[PDB]
Amino acid sequence: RREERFDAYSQTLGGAGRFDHFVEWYIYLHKRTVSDISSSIKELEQQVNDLQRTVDGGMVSVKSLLEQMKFKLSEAIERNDAVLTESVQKSIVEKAICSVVPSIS
Amino acid sequence: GNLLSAFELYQRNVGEWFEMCRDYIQDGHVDESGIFRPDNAFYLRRLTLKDFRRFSLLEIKLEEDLTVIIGNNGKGKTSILYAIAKTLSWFVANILKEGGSGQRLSEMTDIKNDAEDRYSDVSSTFFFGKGLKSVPIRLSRSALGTAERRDSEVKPAKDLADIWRVINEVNTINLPTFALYNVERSQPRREERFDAYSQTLGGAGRFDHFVEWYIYLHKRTVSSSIKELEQQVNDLQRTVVSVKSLLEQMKFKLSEAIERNDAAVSSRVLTESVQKSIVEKAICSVVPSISNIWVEMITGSDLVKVTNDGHDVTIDQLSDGQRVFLSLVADLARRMVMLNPLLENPLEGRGIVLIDEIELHLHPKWQQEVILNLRSAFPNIQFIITTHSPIVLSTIEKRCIREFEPNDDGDQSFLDSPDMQTKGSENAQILEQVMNVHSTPPGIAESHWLGNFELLLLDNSGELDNHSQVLYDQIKAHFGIDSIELKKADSLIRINKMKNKLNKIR
Amino acid sequence: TKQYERKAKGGNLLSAFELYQRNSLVGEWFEMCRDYIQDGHVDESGIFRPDNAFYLRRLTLKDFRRFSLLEIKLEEDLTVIIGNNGKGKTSILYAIAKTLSWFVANILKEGGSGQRLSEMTDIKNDAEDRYSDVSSTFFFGKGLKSVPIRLSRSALGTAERRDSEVKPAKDLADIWRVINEVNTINLPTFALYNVERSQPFNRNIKDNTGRREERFDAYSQTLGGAGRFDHFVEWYIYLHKRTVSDISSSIKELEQQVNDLQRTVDGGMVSVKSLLEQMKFKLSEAIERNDAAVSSRVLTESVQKSIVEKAICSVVPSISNIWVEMITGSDLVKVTNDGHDVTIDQLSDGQRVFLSLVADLARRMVMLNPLLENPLEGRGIVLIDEIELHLHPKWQQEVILNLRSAFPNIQFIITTHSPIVLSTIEKRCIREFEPNDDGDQSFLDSPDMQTKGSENAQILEQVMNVHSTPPGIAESHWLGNFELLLLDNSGELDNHSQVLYDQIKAHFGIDSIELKKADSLIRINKMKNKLNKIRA
Amino acid sequence: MRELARLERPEILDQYIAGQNDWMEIDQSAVWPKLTEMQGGFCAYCECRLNRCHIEHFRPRGKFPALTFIWNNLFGSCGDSRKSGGWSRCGIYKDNGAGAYNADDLIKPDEENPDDYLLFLTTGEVVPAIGLTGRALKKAQETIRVFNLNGDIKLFGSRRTAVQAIMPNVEYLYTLLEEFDEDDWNEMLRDELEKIESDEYKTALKHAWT
Numbered sequence A: 001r002r003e004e005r006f007d008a009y010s011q012t013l014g015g016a017g018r019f020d021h022f023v024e025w026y027i028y029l030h031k032r033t034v035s036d037i038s039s040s041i042k043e044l045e046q047q048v049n050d051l052q053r054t055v056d057g058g059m060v061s062v063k064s065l066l067e068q069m070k071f072k073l074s075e076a077i078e079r080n081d082a083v084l085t086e087s088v089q090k091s092i093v094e095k096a097i098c099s100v101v102p103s104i105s
Numbered sequence B: 001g002n003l004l005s006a007f008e009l010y011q012r013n014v015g016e017w018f019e020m021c022r023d024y025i026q027d028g029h030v031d032e033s034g035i036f037r038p039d040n041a042f043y044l045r046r047l048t049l050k051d052f053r054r055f056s057l058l059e060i061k062l063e064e065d066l067t068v069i070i071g072n073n074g075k076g077k078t079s080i081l082y083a084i085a086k087t088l089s090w091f092v093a094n095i096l097k098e099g100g101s102g103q104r105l106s107e108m109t110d111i112k113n114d115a116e117d118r119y120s121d122v123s124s125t126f127f128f129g130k131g132l133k134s135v136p137i138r139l140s141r142s143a144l145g146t147a148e149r150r151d152s153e154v155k156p157a158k159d160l161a162d163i164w165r166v167i168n169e170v171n172t173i174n175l176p177t178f179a180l181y182n183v184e185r186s187q188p189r190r191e192e193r194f195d196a197y198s199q200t201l202g203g204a205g206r207f208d209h210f211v212e213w214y215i216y217l218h219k220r221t222v223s224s225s226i227k228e229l230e231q232q233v234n235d236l237q238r239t240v241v242s243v244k245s246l247l248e249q250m251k252f253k254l255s256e257a258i259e260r261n262d263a264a265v266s267s268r269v270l271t272e273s274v275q276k277s278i279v280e281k282a283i284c285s286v287v288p289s290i291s292n293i294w295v296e297m298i299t300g301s302d303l304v305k306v307t308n309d310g311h312d313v314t315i316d317q318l319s320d321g322q323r324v325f326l327s328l329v330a331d332l333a334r335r336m337v338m339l340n341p342l343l344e345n346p347l348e349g350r351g352i353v354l355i356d357e358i359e360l361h362l363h364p365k366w367q368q369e370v371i372l373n374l375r376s377a378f379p380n381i382q383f384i385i386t387t388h389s390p391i392v393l394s395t396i397e398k399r400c401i402r403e404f405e406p407n408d409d410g411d412q413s414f415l416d417s418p419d420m421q422t423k424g425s426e427n428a429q430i431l432e433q434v435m436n437v438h439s440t441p442p443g444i445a446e447s448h449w450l451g452n453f454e455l456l457l458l459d460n461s462g463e464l465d466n467h468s469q470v471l472y473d474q475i476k477a478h479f480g481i482d483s484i485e486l487k488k489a490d491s492l493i494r495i496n497k498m499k500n501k502l503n504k505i506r
Numbered sequence C: 001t002k003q004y005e006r007k008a009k010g011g012n013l014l015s016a017f018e019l020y021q022r023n024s025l026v027g028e029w030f031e032m033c034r035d036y037i038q039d040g041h042v043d044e045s046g047i048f049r050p051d052n053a054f055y056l057r058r059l060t061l062k063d064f065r066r067f068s069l070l071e072i073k074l075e076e077d078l079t080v081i082i083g084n085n086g087k088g089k090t091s092i093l094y095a096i097a098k099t100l101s102w103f104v105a106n107i108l109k110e111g112g113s114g115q116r117l118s119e120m121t122d123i124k125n126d127a128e129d130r131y132s133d134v135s136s137t138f139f140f141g142k143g144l145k146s147v148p149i150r151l152s153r154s155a156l157g158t159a160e161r162r163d164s165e166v167k168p169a170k171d172l173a174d175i176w177r178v179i180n181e182v183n184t185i186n187l188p189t190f191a192l193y194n195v196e197r198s199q200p201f202n203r204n205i206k207d208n209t210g211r212r213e214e215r216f217d218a219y220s221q222t223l224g225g226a227g228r229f230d231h232f233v234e235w236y237i238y239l240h241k242r243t244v245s246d247i248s249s250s251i252k253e254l255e256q257q258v259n260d261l262q263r264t265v266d267g268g269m270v271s272v273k274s275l276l277e278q279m280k281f282k283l284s285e286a287i288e289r290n291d292a293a294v295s296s297r298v299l300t301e302s303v304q305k306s307i308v309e310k311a312i313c314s315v316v317p318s319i320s321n322i323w324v325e326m327i328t329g330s331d332l333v334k335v336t337n338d339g340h341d342v343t344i345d346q347l348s349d350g351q352r353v354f355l356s357l358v359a360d361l362a363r364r365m366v367m368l369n370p371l372l373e374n375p376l377e378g379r380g381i382v383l384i385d386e387i388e389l390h391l392h393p394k395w396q397q398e399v400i401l402n403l404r405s406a407f408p409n410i411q412f413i414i415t416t417h418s419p420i421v422l423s424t425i426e427k428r429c430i431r432e433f434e435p436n437d438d439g440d441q442s443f444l445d446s447p448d449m450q451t452k453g454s455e456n457a458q459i460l461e462q463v464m465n466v467h468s469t470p471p472g473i474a475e476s477h478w479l480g481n482f483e484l485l486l487l488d489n490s491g492e493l494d495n496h497s498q499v500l501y502d503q504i505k506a507h508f509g510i511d512s513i514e515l516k517k518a519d520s521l522i523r524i525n526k527m528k529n530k531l532n533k534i535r536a
Numbered sequence D: 001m002r003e004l005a006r007l008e009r010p011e012i013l014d015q016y017i018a019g020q021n022d023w024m025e026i027d028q029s030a031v032w033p034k035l036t037e038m039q040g041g042f043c044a045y046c047e048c049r050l051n052r053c054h055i056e057h058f059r060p061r062g063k064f065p066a067l068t069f070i071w072n073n074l075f076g077s078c079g080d081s082r083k084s085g086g087w088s089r090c091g092i093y094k095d096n097g098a099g100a101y102n103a104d105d106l107i108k109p110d111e112e113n114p115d116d117y118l119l120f121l122t123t124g125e126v127v128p129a130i131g132l133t134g135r136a137l138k139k140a141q142e143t144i145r146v147f148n149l150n151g152d153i154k155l156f157g158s159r160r161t162a163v164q165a166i167m168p169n170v171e172y173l174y175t176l177l178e179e180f181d182e183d184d185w186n187e188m189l190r191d192e193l194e195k196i197e198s199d200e201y202k203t204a205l206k207h208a209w210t
């Protein structure tokens, strides 16, 4: 299992790393972060807020999308509300990669 | 209302004849039960086998809805299904491609080993409404090293398949489903309409394919004019960090809409959301003890979950029997949805489905349920199935059953229905009357003790002598004090004592 | 020492062997070990019975897969595991197979390793102790009443390692290996037949390198789950070729060629000396192989052939004969199936799969038991998953009896969901596997009802919890409803009871069991009522 | 198997003579009504209800061509010779399946009472009667073998089931012996034994009752 802590020692001195294990682990982290409703609520709240600002700025074409997202947010809030360590882990790694690898933002 | 004549006139020339052909294929009605019924049904009516494998000559008439073939090991039940599948391969090949070639009989294995005339024939007659009452096809093969080769006669199959192909090319129509599910089902680019015919007559109904497909459909259906969508994409692009995920989703939706718009009539298809829903309902309707199926991603892996007997479990917690059956139904439903886009319920489409050993890996409990709902879910499919299970036969009408006699030397001309009604009958009766098996094992000594006990009672004028007492004690010791066998013995004692008393009161 | 001498003279096998190893009275101790393994008697039925039987007595699973703790006692002859939950039944057979791998490895090679438990799949997910154990106890006569083996595995990063304890199994396997090396003995057969055994037949059969003739090829892939029916076919064709050929004719021909070549070298043709030396080497090798074959105390190829043919024909009902045809310069195995001569690839799937099982097992037994009059009376443990796979009811009624007749000293551990199979087995041999929702169970129960010789309808209801009639069919309830209506109307046919009677008659027919039962009910209730009126 | 009462020689058998005529010539529908009057629409040997049926020569036309249009030789057996399917008892089995037999070592049910030789156990096996030796035993043994009266599973099962259905009614009658007077109880048993003339496997049911 890629989320098991001692998997960090798996083929660690083999010479190539395990970039395949990274990708699997990162997708895992993503799925867990998406699935927790509060971050999804926070993300949805942020999306609703961004869409509301666009509608207030004169773009009447996105009003239908705002109403859909507001409904999704209300539903998410209604569904049983509970910070994920998985979300933080994901952020740390993303920042490391972006800081060290020049071409990747 | 001759379909071939109408089509020939269409090919030579024009709108009227096209419409007549299209209406012949597409017209139907909804019956009193709310089920769509095609006006022109398509099914296999008759099959004849000559010097094929074990059969010197065999003729079978099939039911429009369900035919169940039963017999001992090596009676040729699988041979029959193989013969049909090879015939059906000619329809599939010609629906896909003009002048496509179907499969052929093996010169090494399929000719009967002691056939004096060294060739084999598989003759099938299909029905397609009153306009086309008889579509005869013959597959033939001569043995290896014979001077004279015998020709297969496949033009009628090609002609009919041509009508489906050509009419579909001009205007989308519903197409027939052909599938074979053999015993191998148990062994461990975007989607396009005619993928429904890929590996339909061998390789179908594998669990891993389902799971992969199902998860894929779920991911796509997690979260509508092109111009409106183009405008929304443009507006979202101008706004673009938190809205980037939404932009990518909308770009995908736009691309899909353009693709659907660009895609041809001949490949036109139901939305992924609808497809998913139909398959889910099919599974839950057909499969014993599954009430719900869904994809979770909350633990971090993609898991298919099911509600099995009221408990939510992972699909890997299902028995192998349930997995194999789930896979069969899911596969069939998938193909039906792809081939019947114009129907309100795509599972009410036409077709012929062959299933070998339907009870494969099923516990008796589920054997009692499997056929019940299959015909309700797929009302216009002709099912031809093989089984060894009296439990399965207890759910089926005798008219659907075709039995090989136990002493069949492979010369017999017909397969026939059993004399007893099987539907609703006791399994012990089906075993003896239909499957020619004793309800108790004759090779076990204890199976004869009650008979022997009775004979001893009758030899000693009904009185329990030393010998009868010993055997009684053996019965009691072996079967137990509460056993049906002991109760029968007790009954025999009581009756015989009373009979003897009467005899003495002369 | 004197203590070992006393225990050895008392009949302790390990003590006798230790004395043998240290002194290598060395001949006496060797003979004692050999006699312990080889001694047996022919019983009243004419069947050879080893004095010292070998079988698995007990199995315990701790934090293994779904099981927190599970204990199973096994029968010396036949144990059948039943239950709906088929992914647990298979786990039990897998656990046994891994344990048996340790015997096989050590019979083949000193310090051979069997199979380990997986850290990923074999440890229960919510195990507090984060390790798994598979503990087995074997029996080998009164001299060795308990041979314990434990396979263990701990999770990564635990503070203590949990190692396997396998020395007793290795010690026993070493006795078999070492004694056999000195003087040929009979060896135990271990085999696993999973649902994998149902696989299609590759017809195009491979060139005999000559691994198949080696005695310990009998242990090749023996616990892999499929058997090796391909290996059987190769071996069987090989046996045929050797039977048609003369023995040492190649040696005689080679002897003649070496004699002719020797005459040429004596006649002054020194250029052919290199060829003579090569041919002399070939002759010596052929003699050695012949001598080794002679030294290996093996049965003649003709006899081996006969044994296997008889076994197959006895166990597999549809097969009356099996033979090798030499036609179109390619050897084919043919069978007489249901009175007709066919190739193996022409057999039905049910027949082929079962043939494959029996053929494989028989081949291995013949190879491992060369000193027995009937090699199929050898010792061993055989595991079979889903024995009813592809079998009609008629075969289900005979399969266990046929297997036990052909292999009378094998311990069979099998799984089934067939009531028909259960009707041929004693309740003591049956173990029922009803887990909780979490999969866990502590003990496996024998059923309360005796199954052997019982009606299949009773086994369905009493053991498998399935009704005699399908509950989802209305007609299945009509006779019950009819009885209820009779009882409600003081045993007179009212309009409602008559309608239902007519429906029963119309649906099931005039000579149906159902109608006869209805008629019986009418007649008995009429007679009860007449009695009641007489009393009034 | 029942004791049969043959009486009337039918008209059409006088016209055809053996040697000159062949059996296939005859109108078989002329023969049936008197066999149906004799046997009561049941088989001669097993006592099934007839639906697939044929005219059976007790001594066969191959072995005994003189006995061909003789009224004593004819019986209504179950099963159909023509139909594309196996039948494995009674007439068809005697000829095909049974193989070698002496015709003198069979119970002819019109000549003899079969109740002296055969016994039907309530388990639905037919056995030789209690206390037989020599020729009488050899008749009982061969009649069971040649008509296949236990080997046919369909027959064995059908008979066993028929009897098992009435064994509640048998046990309950013989309990009420105690309380009832003789003349009324004898009427009860006479009533039950009258009913089973309409029933299938009547001899096997008789032995359960008597």
Ligand SMILES: Nc1ncnc2c1ncn2[C@@H]1O[C@H](COP(=O)(O)OP(=O)(O)O)[C@@H](O)[C@H]1O
Pocket (backbone or CB within 6 Å): B052, B053, B054, B071, B072, B073, B074, B075, B076, B077, B078, B079, B080, B109, B110, B111, B112, B113, B114, C337, C338, C340, C342, C346, C347, C348, C349, C350
């Ligand atoms: N070419 C052949 N000639 C004669 N018999 C054959 C030939 N091929 C197969 N058979 C016979 O056909 C039977 C296999 O038919 P199959 O359909 O597999 O049976 P099942 O009903 O058990 O599925 C076997 O009895 C086999 O001997």
Ligand SMILES: [Zn+2]
Pocket (backbone or CB within 6 Å): D043, D044, D045, D046, D047, D048, D077, D078, D089, D090, D091
């Ligand atoms: Zn009869």
